Amino acid sequence: HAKTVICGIINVTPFALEQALQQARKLIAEGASMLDIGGESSYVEIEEEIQRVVPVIKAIRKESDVLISIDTWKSQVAEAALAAGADLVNDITGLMGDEKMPHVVAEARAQVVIMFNPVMARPQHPSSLIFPHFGFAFTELADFETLPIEELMEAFFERALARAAEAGIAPENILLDPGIGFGLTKKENLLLLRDLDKLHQKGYPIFLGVSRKRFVINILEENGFEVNPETELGFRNRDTASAHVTSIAARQGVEVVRVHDVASHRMAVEIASAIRLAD
């Protein structure tokens, strides 16, 4: 199969155009094969989000054929971004935050990343408390509160995939993201990483968030590594640590990794893929 694709993160802060565009050039030059453009954070909110992402996507498209993902759970943002040149929707709510999102994805013949969102699945969970509310979902959740994380992920994807099917999104256009670092305990995050192959066995490509995750940073700090991101050494250690997770992921055929620091993950991908693809 093909080596792991590296998807670089571009967050457009609410001049912003030019900074996003600078980072786009940087990540492309470091070997990103995809860019994930995000503008998050009512009609006023949607319009402001559109005005962040659409300029950037048009600008990037003029000088690059790179695959562009629009990172939004809002159908209106996705529709506008796809029209402007984005190739796929990265939906952190996995089609559960907006009932219109499946139709938008289908009509555009676009690809979609369906993220498992444990925050929406377990709103009262201790790890989810500090997160915002995603979405414009689930009935009276009681069951979800109890379920072992892998069972809950399956339950969530069953619902999300049903939504994709009644919209007519082709199965081959769907990627799954297990939602690492989104309202999960340390053990759960590690279990989901351990069991990436089980997720892959479902038959969809995996889009994996490996970058600057709190549980990984906690492994470093408890083992004596500097982790302060306002130091050169801490900043570096954080990215190297994420790149170790990419090494593992790429070796087992994960199709896409979503990352901040493309260069460090390129090292990991090239090593890991050379091994995986030895014969």
Swiss-Prot record:
The keyword Ribonucleoprotein does not apply. (7,8-dihydropterin-6-yl)methyl diphosphate binds at residues 71, 90, 177, 213, 258-260. Gene3D superfamilies: Dihydropteroate synthase-like. GO terms for molecular function: dihydropteroate synthase activity; metal ion binding. Is potently inhibited by sulfonamides, with Ki values between 25 nM and 850 nM. It comes from the Bacteria. One of its GO terms (biological process) is tetrahydrofolate biosynthetic process. It catalyses: (7,8-dihydropterin-6-yl)methyl diphosphate + 4-aminobenzoate = 7,8-dihydropteroate + diphosphate. Its EC number is 2.5.1.15. Its cofactor is Mg(2+). CDD domains: DHPS. Keywords: Antibiotic resistance, Folate biosynthesis, Magnesium, Metal-binding, Transferase. Pfam families: Pterin_bind (PF00809). Mg(2+) binds at residue 11. Homodimer. PANTHER family: FOLATE SYNTHESIS PROTEINS, FOLIC ACID SYNTHESIS PROTEIN FOL1. Catalyzes the condensation of para-aminobenzoate (pABA) with 6-hydroxymethyl-7,8-dihydropterin diphosphate (DHPt-PP) to form 7,8-dihydropteroate, the immediate precursor of folate derivatives. Reaction proceeds via an ordered binding mechanism, with DHPPP binding to the enzyme first, inducing a structural change which forms the pABA-binding site. This is Dihydropteroate synthase. The gene is sulA.
